[PDB]
Design a protein around this ligand. Structure first.
Ligand code: HEM
Ligand code: HEM
Ligand SMILES: COc1ccc(-c2noc(CN(C(=O)Cc3ccc([N+](=O)[O-])cc3)C(C)C)n2)cc1
Ligand SMILES: COc1ccc(-c2noc(CN(C(=O)Cc3ccc([N+](=O)[O-])cc3)C(C)C)n2)cc1
Lengths: 377, 376
């Protein structure tokens, strides 16, 4: 570990570096990672690679705060300190966290979920009906990116007309900002039956924009990555692809294994609020703690054959949707996207070939695939 | 006017559309511009094109707020309502405006001004010495953008090794995350610069908005004054020759450059009460847009208003604002202009614009994106 820099994004340019996290779990489940020239804030942090310790952190939100601790002015849930801490739901603590979490969740009505689902089935069919069998195309740009973008546009009440223009936005920061502000003002003047309207008509003007941005570039991006990643895992494990396409009652379990395997959000930060021990190491109030769900999800202490993709895997207590009070509000929506996409795809196609090497997102906050060129037959 | 859409940015694609504002001043100095598909917030606004009325709005900050008014949640100083109203200096009212304005000006010390000048002379000379005489080149990217970006880097204490990289930011992410560490460093280790002064006195989120504002707007307005000044002087080779022969004409010439280019040609406010402007009834909460760019060619105030004249006197232009929000950086912008043109004119009596200027498509900035020139 003394020669390994988890903050050097060159180590994440080619996918989540599971080899380095096997070293981390063996050598030091919990350890103090000294800052390098790549480390945000120039500051060291406790790094946690094992499942037990990751879960222990997630399950104690008083000790390990999503806001700040000690004398640190602001923290948040990514490695760099951000003043958005306290101002967006994922970066709030009780009591306001609970109030906002429930407000957002009250937007996920049965009818909204049907509205999402009906659109998703229509779209996934149209997209898969338009694939020329055998012809190479970029699965990420043509399919994986589209479905979740439409899902969150529907959740947030983005007019169908604006959706592709809005996507180019994720002058880009500017377009996004000035568009969302108008969309938000519209829902206040004229309430509509969507999540943005629920929330806007209940957060400060500024916080409502940060909420919009978050769903829009975390909810869409993570789900897109699960889909692209799942297709890649299935191309690389073709006997499992055949087993799965023979028996769609295997999909619930296959989907949980896709999320475990891909871990689209593989890292999470907190800030200690008090002296505490974790993994036998003394943490002081104010110090940063980074947990790596991407590593925890391959911990051989918890998962048998952890480095193998197994669509029949049970049990599967993965941490790819988080755990505890901040658990993914979108977990059933991401599963829904995955289920429909793979039902429609695997129905038509039993052969999936990746014809160029996957290009990965250069990041340790996301594990994502920017381009995936495939042939489906 | 009913056929003219001031929110359609195609009308600004080839420069500030002075001819349209000539129609505006003649037909209705103050008028209700109805919303079109191009209008932010889909909401109408009063448009003010004459000097008298523009000055009247700028000089009454209580009636014409830079935050909001009526029942509008938020306004600010651009046409679109923005929630940064109340959070950045230019979009604050008293009592907090005065407090922050004074803090920001305490940052402008004689030594800082000297630090800027020293750097500016060396750089300007370095850049002008590097020009191939007769060779075409983009004056905007090569010279006019660099000098003010360095100025604001010095004001804000941006380390020299970071500056080129920071400028590429003006992604949104990189500017935000970089600025946050810079600000934190000055808190940890105070330095002799304006960012340090302001950070060690504003919320953590307001310090970012302050950094973004200076770093963006301060550099861009000044850049545009520099490039537009070159262009006006190339189109008036007569006065270029006179100016080149007598550098004690620079102070007066620079005020004419600012009047003429008016890099910040529009400003928004929000009425806070019922009031009359230009004989038209404005209600509390309504938007008022003033156009300094039109006001600065108003023939009731300026003789031969449509002519560029370096010897123009008097020159009560509104290119730096007026009243309580008056530009804090006016001397700095004048200093950039003075040094650049001194060093350039020293070396060069001939300025040819070889391709036609490419303008920024904007009614918030009047700016040149590209100006290919030959100096001899
Ligand atoms: C496969 C796709 C997804 C993954 C892997 C993912 C993962 C996560 C994780 C790990 C967290 C916990 C954050 C923490 O502990 O700080 C979380 C929270 C969150 N997720 Fe997801 N998510 C996905 C899709 C979605 C979607 C589609 C939505 C849209 C509703 C969404 C909405 C949220 C929200 C609002 C939270 C914050 C909840 C809170 O802090 O109380 N997620 N997600
Ligand atoms: C030629 C270039 C410049 C132009 C045309 C310009 C123009 C303006 C104008 C018209 C205003 C009035 C804003 C309003 O009424 O809402 C203003 C304000 C401002 N200017 Fe400049 N400016 C220039 C350069 C700079 C520079 C270099 C600085 C760097 C210190 C600067 C700092 C500011 C600040 C902080 C304000 C806000 C002051 C307040 O609201 O109290 N400006 N400027
Ligand atoms: C102001 O700059 C930022 C930077 C990062 C964030 C950020 N918030 O969470 C994360 C990491 N992350 C998660 O913690 C999972 C997640 C959070 C929220 C949602 N969502 O759709 O609302 C999905 C996934 C995702 C983006 C991989 N990053 C927010 C604001
Ligand atoms: C989207 O968020 C914002 C924030 C601020 C602005 C904004 N603030 O002022 C203006 C227009 N403007 C001015 O009013 C003049 C000005 C203000 C401040 C500075 N400065 O260096 O601090 C220079 C010029 C300039 C940029 C042409 N625009 C616009 C959008």
């Amino acid at each position: 570990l003394s020669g390994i820099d988890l903050t050097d994004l060159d180590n994440f340019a080619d996918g989540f570096p599971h080899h380095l996290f096997a070293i981390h779990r063996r050598e030091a489940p919990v350890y103090w990672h000294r800052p390098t020239e790549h480390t945000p804030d120039g500051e060291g942090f406790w790094s946690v690679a094992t499942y037990a310790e990751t879960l222990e952190v997630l399950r104690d939100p008083v000790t390990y705060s999503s806001v700040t601790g000690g004398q640190r002015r602001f923290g948040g849930t990514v490695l760099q300190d951000l003043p958005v801490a306290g101002q967006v739901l994922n970066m709030m603590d009780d009591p306001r966290h609970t109030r906002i979490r429930r407000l957002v969740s009250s937007g996920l009505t049965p009818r909204m979920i049907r509205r999402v689902e009906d659109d998703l089935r229509r779209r996934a069919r149209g997209l898969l009906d338009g694939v020329e069998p055998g012809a190479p195309f970029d699965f990420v740009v043509e399919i994986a990116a589209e479905l979740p973008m439409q899902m969150i546009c529907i959740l947030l009440g983005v007019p169908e007309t604006d959706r592709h223009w809005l996507f180019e936005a994720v002058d880009a920061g500017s377009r996004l900002y000035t568009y969302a502000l108008e969309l938000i003002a519209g829902k206040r003047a004229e309430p509509a039956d969507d999540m943005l309207s629920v929330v806007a008509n209940a957060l400060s003007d500024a916080e409502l924009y940060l909420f919009f941005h978050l769903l829009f570039s975390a909810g869409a991006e993570t789900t897109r990555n699960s889909i692209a990643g799942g297709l890649l895992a299935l191309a690389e494990n073709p006997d499992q692809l055949q087993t799965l396409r023979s028996d769609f009652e295997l999909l619930p379990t296959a989907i949980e294994e896709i999320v475990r395997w891909t871990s689209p959000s593989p890292s999470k930060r907190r800030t200690a609020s008090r002296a505490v021990s974790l993994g036998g190491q003394p943490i002081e109030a104010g110090q940063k703690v980074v947990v790596w769900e991407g590593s925890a999800n391959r911990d051989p202490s918890v998962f048998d054959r952890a480095d193998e993709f197994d669509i029949t895997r049970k049990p599967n207590p993965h941490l790819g949707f988080g755990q505890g009070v901040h658990y993914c509000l979108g977990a059933n929506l991401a599963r829904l996207e995955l289920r429909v996409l793979f039902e429609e795809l695997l129905s038509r196609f039993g052969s999936v070939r990746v014809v160029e090497p996957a290009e990965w997102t250069r990041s340790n906050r996301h594990t994502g695939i920017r381009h995936l060129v495939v042939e489906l037959r």
